Paper text:
The recombinases Rad51 and Dmc1 are highly conserved in the RecA family; Rad51 is mainly responsible for DNA repair in somatic cells during mitosis while Dmc1 only works during meiosis in germ cells. This spatiotemporal difference is probably due to their distinctive mismatch tolerance during HR: Rad51 does not permit HR in the presence of mismatches, whereas Dmc1 can tolerate certain mismatches. Both are ATPases and require ATP or its non-hydrolysable analogs to assemble on single-stranded DNA (ssDNA) as the presynaptic complex, which leads to searching for homologous double-stranded DNA (dsDNA) in chromosomes.
Using procedures described previously, we obtained cryo-EM structures of the presynaptic and postsynaptic complexes of ScDmc1 wt at the resolutions of 3.2 and 3.4 Å, respectively, and those of hRAD51 wt at 3.0 and 4.0 Å, respectively; these resolutions were higher than for previously reported structures. All four helical assemblies share almost the same right-handed helical symmetry with about 6.3 protomers per turn and a helical pitch of 100 Å. In the ScDmc1 presyaptic complex and hRAD51 presynaptic complex with RS-1 which is a compound could enhance the DNA exchange activity, one DNA nucleotide-triplet in a B-form conformation interacts with two consecutive protomers. In ScDmc1, the first phosphate within the triplet is bound by S265 of Dmc1-5′, Q236 and H285 of Dmc1-0, the second phosphate interacts with G283, G284 and R235 of Dmc1-0, and the third phosphate interacts with R223 of Dmc1-0. ScDmc1, which is highly conserved with RecA, ScRad51 and hRAD51, has similar Walker A and B motifs for ATP hydrolysis and the surrounding hydrogen bonds network for coupling of ATP binding and DNA interaction.
Author numbering:
A (entry chain A), B (entry chain B), C (entry chain C): 16 to 330, 334
Amino acid sequence: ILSVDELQNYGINASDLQKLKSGGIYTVNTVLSTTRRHLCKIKGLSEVKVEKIKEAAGKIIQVGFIPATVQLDIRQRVYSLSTGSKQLDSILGGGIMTMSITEVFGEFRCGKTQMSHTLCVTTQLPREMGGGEGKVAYIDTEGTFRPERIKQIAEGYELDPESCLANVSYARALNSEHQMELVEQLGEELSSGDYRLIVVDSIMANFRVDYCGRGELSERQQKLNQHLFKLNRLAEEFNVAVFLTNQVQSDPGASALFASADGRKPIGGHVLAHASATRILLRKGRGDERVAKLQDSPDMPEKECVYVIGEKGITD
Amino acid sequence: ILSVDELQNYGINASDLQKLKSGGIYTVNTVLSTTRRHLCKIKGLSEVKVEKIKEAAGKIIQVGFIPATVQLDIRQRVYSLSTGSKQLDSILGGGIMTMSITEVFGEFRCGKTQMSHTLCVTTQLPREMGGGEGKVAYIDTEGTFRPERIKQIAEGYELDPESCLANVSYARALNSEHQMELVEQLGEELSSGDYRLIVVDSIMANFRVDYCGRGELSERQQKLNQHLFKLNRLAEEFNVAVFLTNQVQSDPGASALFASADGRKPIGGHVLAHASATRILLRKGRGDERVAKLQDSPDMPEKECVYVIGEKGITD
Amino acid sequence: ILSVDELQNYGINASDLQKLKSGGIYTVNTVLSTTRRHLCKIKGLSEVKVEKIKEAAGKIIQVGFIPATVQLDIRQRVYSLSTGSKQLDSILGGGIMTMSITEVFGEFRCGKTQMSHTLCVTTQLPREMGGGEGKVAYIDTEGTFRPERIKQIAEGYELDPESCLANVSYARALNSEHQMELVEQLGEELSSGDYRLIVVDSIMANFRVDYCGRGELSERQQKLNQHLFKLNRLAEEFNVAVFLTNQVQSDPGASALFASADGRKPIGGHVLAHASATRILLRKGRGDERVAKLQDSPDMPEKECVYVIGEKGITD
DNA sequence: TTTTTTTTT
Ligand SMILES: Nc1ncnc2c1ncn2[C@@H]1O[C@H](COP(=O)(O)OP(=O)(O)OP(=O)(O)O)[C@@H](O)[C@H]1O
Ligand SMILES: Nc1ncnc2c1ncn2[C@@H]1O[C@H](COP(=O)(O)OP(=O)(O)OP(=O)(O)O)[C@@H](O)[C@H]1O
Ligand SMILES: Nc1ncnc2c1ncn2[C@@H]1O[C@H](COP(=O)(O)OP(=O)(O)OP(=O)(O)O)[C@@H](O)[C@H]1O
Ligand SMILES: [Mg+2]
Ligand SMILES: [Mg+2]
Ligand SMILES: [Mg+2]
């Protein structure tokens, strides 16, 4: 896709282009998607300058009213991914759709971080297997990222381990304000190359700790909302898919619907429920089998599925 | 590792450096990991001052996107430890991995407060035996720390008792708010020397008593979450391993899965289940043998094991 | 040990010192051990006042990180006691260790509110006999405290009866909530003089009756947990030993391990099993001999023993 | 929006 350099040739000075780029902008879409009020806060751009920039941008590409079918065709390159279990993949329509947010949540030991580790490997595959030749960015908020597991699960897919380990990009988000800047940065390298998947293990880990003490909640929710908005922007303009791992809490409210199974009701209020495109609930079954359930999706209706976490990642 | 003194030479006044240090900060990583909102609450630092501090810090070390392999190499110094029973150690991959949280729980007289006593001794050993030349900090929340047992188990490992007893550091946490400040303090001496293991016997003993009376639960869980977050931060930035002993409760709910064996379902809700890296269940077997089970780990799958608590600590 | 009067001279008003003392506080350790949240509930102390109090306290004594050996030395005055039967005493390491909780349980006539009666007498002895020159507090929850037996067993130890009977302190706990206040009160007179042993005959007698009807269990367990916590605090800060007599129940569950000997499985759930330092099971043997077994101790491993309840208390 | 607790006979 085209960078912010193409518009360097529409009567635009190469002076603040470096300044824009410094402000986080790295392509044109991110320009069109950015608000003037926000563009005029990069400390060194002029309002009239900003208007000239916006006009140059609108020059290259336009955003009007595609009838519907050009939409159906642009969406043809939606580029789904395989999760690692034909049952689940079929329960999603192919798996983790791209340019969208999928959130999976459940109680501990529930095949969570495991599914992310497998995804990291089921992505450097030919498209006719579920994913294709895409790098992967991995932001971890709790540790528990093990390259070994990556190599292991890879061998189970006959892929050279080193090769895979050479197409992941690991970042350890220390605190929420650091996690947020991580995505800003991301917006650059996502702008050049083939990145297919972003992984946020426990998106709301840090937030839960930074803004404690209700009376401080609205601020936490607003920060989280800005974060999710940015994430979705990225996932849409770079044809990449976002995979979020969430947690759960116990409702001491009451036992009525259906009075049991407290390992539900994830954290993050409605702010995160709305912003999330697909919602999946992972529950502990029997023996070493787990039950996956699909709660929120725009494509499918609903279903149940059963999977096993073996030595080759999620399987059947 | 580098202290907070290195950044004393990047256009930083030596005035509040003492003030930072007083606030708990003792190295640079703890600086990078700290939030501005939190840094601006040390009662005597300026917001612009805080920004200059953060910039100086980011000067020394950076946190970007290691591809994956530099990660696999930095993790090479993960420095596992031996538990005292080849069967268990092999069931963990070597034992108590460093820079991570391992929680062991079970009903009484399972000697979980004995595995800690043995760990205290299996740490001042050459690395080719399971542990290496590391001091040990021991925070007890129930008493029951016996130096004698330490000397005894040591002699069983031919180590001079006095020598071992001279590399432990004992602290008696009276109440939860005191327990929390203990770790703050810890962050200092952990900053200089060779500390390999932190032990919290009955992490949730005090919490269970301080915040009683549901309707007061959320506050307890939030305090506990802050605590665990801090603990994991420490365990990660100082290459030290955290070992927590938990308790259990009886579920008067029902008898369905599998209607018996009530000595399970530890205390601490999901807040502690999630934050815990490895979970081990200790159960009473037959005669004087106990059964260890591994419920949650990111590295291994699952397994059973059998051990005996003799006169040389946990054994076979 | 030092009282709460020492801190009356660190810029502290003598106004609420009386108020603190009224709230149960009688020494400094109890101050350091008390939570602010709890201190600010004495109806007439100020939060800033509480902070000044805590600072004054921390002035006198500090609680940091003793390495280990100062611990081994402070523990040198652990001051064990003799039970009355060389076999048992040797099976404990000397007998009832001080600053700790020892619980003995078994079926009726089994020998346990008798061992308490003997302890009452084996305490006013020179230290080189098992105990030393310590008074004794006796809280009975079922009656069955007989001064006669005390005099009798004493004569068998050639001690003047009146002398012994003059160093016991008897309290009849009518109900659970009264039993709890008993210990609060205790905290005062324990603060001045030589008290070596506290005895709670049938700790859980009253609780069993007050909170009946499961659906009311959690509350009972929480009250009991607060109680045990307080007891252990006392036993630790006053170098006194706590001796609890428990009961037993029949498991209509099944007959598998080992299908007989129902006179086991005491009452009090895991809350009491955990909090208990040493656990002893008294069983009926043959003729007039009883079998003692040691189930939970931090010092010794395990063992069996045999004793006889004669006219001089527990003997061989 | 947030957060689980507890055996009996
Ligand atoms: N030297 C020893 N001294 C005391 N007990 C020993 C010794 N060696 C082995 N044991 C036995 O090993 C077991 C250890 O129990 P442990 O210390 O694990 O209790 P815990 O689980 O830590 O505490 P609790 O069960 O009260 O929460 C006990 O049965 C104990 O009697
Ligand atoms: N190679 C392996 N190493 C470790 N565990 C494995 C392996 N293969 C399968 N497992 C098992 O699969 C399960 C994976 O748990 P998972 O990694 O999903 O925890 P999580 O849900 O990501 O983290 P948490 O539950 O603590 O929030 C564990 O029970 C684990 O023991
Ligand atoms: N001087 C004495 N007076 C009464 N009984 C004595 C005496 N000396 C020995 N015994 C016997 O020793 C045993 C003591 O029983 P004990 O006092 O331990 O009952 P307990 O277990 O305390 O109470 P319960 O069993 O009702 O809960 C009884 O069988 C008792 O008859
Ligand atoms: Mg996880
Ligand atoms: Mg213990
Ligand atoms: Mg009795």
